[PDB]
Amino acid sequence: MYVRISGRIRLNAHSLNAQGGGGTNYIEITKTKVTVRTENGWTVVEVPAITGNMLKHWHFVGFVDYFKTTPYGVNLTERALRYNGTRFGQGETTATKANGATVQLNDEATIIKELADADVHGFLAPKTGRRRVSLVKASFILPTEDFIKEVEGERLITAIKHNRVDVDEKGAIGSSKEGTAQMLFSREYATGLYGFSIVLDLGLVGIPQGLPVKFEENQPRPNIVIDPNERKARIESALKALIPMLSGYIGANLARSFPVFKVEELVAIASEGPIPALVHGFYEDYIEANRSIIKNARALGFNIEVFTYNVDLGEDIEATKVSSVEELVANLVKMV
Amino acid sequence: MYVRISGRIRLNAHSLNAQGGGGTNYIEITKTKVTVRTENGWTVVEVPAITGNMLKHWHFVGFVDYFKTTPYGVNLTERALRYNGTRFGQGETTATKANGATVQLNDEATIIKELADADVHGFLAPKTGRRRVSLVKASFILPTEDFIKEVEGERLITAIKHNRVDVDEKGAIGSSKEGTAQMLFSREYATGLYGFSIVLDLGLVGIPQGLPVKFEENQPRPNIVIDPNERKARIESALKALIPMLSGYIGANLARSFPVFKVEELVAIASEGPIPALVHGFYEDYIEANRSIIKNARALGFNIEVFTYNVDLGEDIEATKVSSVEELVANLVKMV
Amino acid sequence: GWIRNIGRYLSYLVDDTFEEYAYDVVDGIAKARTQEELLEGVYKALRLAPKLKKKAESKGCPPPRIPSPEDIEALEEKVEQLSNPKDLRKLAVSLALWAFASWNNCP
Amino acid sequence: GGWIRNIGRYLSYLVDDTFEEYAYDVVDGIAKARTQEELLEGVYKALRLAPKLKKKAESKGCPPPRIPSPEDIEALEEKVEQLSNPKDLRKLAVSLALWAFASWNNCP
Amino acid sequence: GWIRNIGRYLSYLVDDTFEEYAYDVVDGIAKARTQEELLEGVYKALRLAPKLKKKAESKGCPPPRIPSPEDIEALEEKVEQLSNPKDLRKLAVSLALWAFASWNNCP
RNA sequence: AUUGAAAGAGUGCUUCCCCAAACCCUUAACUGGUUGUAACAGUU
DNA sequence: TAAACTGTTACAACCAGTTAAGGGTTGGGGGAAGCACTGGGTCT
User: Its GO biological process terms (chains A, B) (predicted)?
Assistant: First the structure.
């Protein structure tokens, strides 16, 4: 089922999704140009951010973590166990399976039915040319527009040095001729009131893209290949994989940095039918825009439920109040 | 019937429509030259751009998504469910049917009746030579000229490295000699006040171009080869396909970019007869031009309806200020 | 002069033995109305050259070699005085033509 | 005048073989830069990856990697600052990117 | 013009001999994406200036030359005049780029 | 004003239409600016 | 009734290690490539 959860978080001293030193100790983090008004024209300013690839990979990590506990997690890629983001990266032939079998890149529907890792995040098997668009279109992580407007500066990035001190069997720091292992590096750590918007098209997970339906007697049902129980378990695990995202299990340098997170304002929409996606948290009128789109979609007619985290939003809206993220996804999966 | 939409949308952190620069790993976004005076003559500057072909593909995606829910969604291409816009590719003398059969090419009316994709988004079969110009016209999503004035460039683009990390079954990263797939592909992400404009000529759906009018008694009458209910359903589905085109679904690499994609300002006009197309949002100032166009068209004798959002459109121009794009499509489908 | 080596090292992209077929780079080099875009095309050729070398040494065929520096010097000192577009088009088309030739890649 | 050969030497040393440090991100940044700021950042990063090249050359016995002359930096600054036209700026950046790939006199 | 002297001193930080390296300050003054950390790194270099003077007058080199005050205030006026991040980043990178050049400081 | 006087290769033609450089892809990972050093001695 | 004298402005190690810098898949399909209008001889 289609679920779109957007909102804002607060970050302090995070080195998430660095660009990398590229031989330099000053580890570049990812930057992005953003438009702000500042009452003198919407000029573009460079601000720290992390890509949607970060959120996609960490959603995959939560996916495999939750399948490590579900009884139906046996059908998973052995690469997926080690948080390996690669999905058929090289032009291989027979993919290894954690169960102890192998997968052949033929009859894509068979891979969809059997393998569960490449059902929501897609795959790009390059030798057989079998591709599948993913169903987790993760967004970027950018601050609030008025935040940058009202700071008119105060770079959200700080440079902090670190060193890997050498001590040897003789108790010394080897300079050149007895071990040149002592090393320093400067890392960039960022902060700010960032926003995110995760769209999740779980409605056709487990449905091969080649033949989503059959229409044998003109009926509106998808061409399912797996039993409904396993599909529902996969949907629940994929949606619960969003729980560690909104708590501090995303970004790079998760061991050394481990960014601090919070729940400030979250708006979530959930429905079986196709619904418009919300706006990535970057602006000030995003709450108003979300309220407008929800009320207009309800006017059109949709079986869509809205979950709000202590936000004003507005009146004449049947949105349900939420208090955290795991209870939010529990309420989302409350029906089967 | 005929509806022309235009406006200005603020985008950030998007790698939408990236060419890739050939087989190299440095994926670069589409860039097109534009003319900006900068008070020193209309100088040519290369700016990030979005092809209208992508808009056509995403309109196709929205159309099939909203036609799936319709009770008459069976009459669709097999590749429509596949989210594949390829209609009548190389060496294709037949049409793939979603029911599991084939359609022979004998007349354009039969093609449009059996396959709504060729009816709306057009088709081209080289084997038979049959041609049909699409009813959907898409323009390049270009940043506002006034935006270029107020930012004076700054390259509008950030470069982000996206190292694909691979771990072998043993647990080694590998040096490409063990079959591992490690790789550095870099991507370009842009921003700015882009301008969008789409023309939707929903007056030929179910009306073949070979003989759009029959002239039974020397009177104008569309040659609707389909039932009126099917034509109305196609109208509604195509008009509702604009909702993902404006909410969150646009461009390429949506799985890893998913920009904010909010509507800063929007104008749209609808009529049962031919109407002038809206001016793009690329220009620094087009509100007065749009006001003049609308008022002069209304004075000419055109019964057009105008819907605006975040644009005053003067005082003597009548227009219902919609709150979102969903309200716009509701007004577009309210008159049937 | 200095056309033989650049043509030989540019023809590797479109050569049959390399299954990447960078037709786009040669297309951009061919009909280039300004110097900057043909320079970008040959830069893309040189950027894809390490990939061709890697695939050649993986397959077994002799690896391609980077064009000699004097060739680059000649190209740079000739491209500056392309005041008329005709000579620039002539140079770009000559490079494109020498990008389509037979070479002894895999014996 | 003079910057051509030295820039080619240094960029080749940054990109050439017998180093196992193939940094193409800097080359791509130098090439694809419509504005002058990113071209300057790319060339600055290329110049910054000098100590790695020197240390590797000393370790493996390769000849030391020559650093471009200060007059070359002078000429670079003058032609970048005096040419506000993006056309000539792109031409210079792509010329530098071309000189990033050259088969000079490598290690014997 | 007014980049040689301060760029010369910046190259005095890391060059041949001079067995004390400081690249964090150069990196900070190069990619000065905000209005500051540029003057911060330049001040850090000026604080290491006595260290460089002592090392030069001790080991093998002639004493280093501090950038002229007119140069410093020219830089300050230039950074005050600019408002867009483009000019600030360009100035910062052009300032810190001279730190890596072939200078014959110690004979 | 002449082997020249009169003198339409000219008159209509959408190189067109259809087509996502598209899809999957955590510079990632591990890594303390670390360790020692009285603003100290002495002052009507 | 007097208003800090002075040695000192960090040393030293280190200034990215490695791994890959596209993998793949396709390089115009397919129709036509002037439709008439203006005839030059040799005979009666």
Answer: defense response to virus
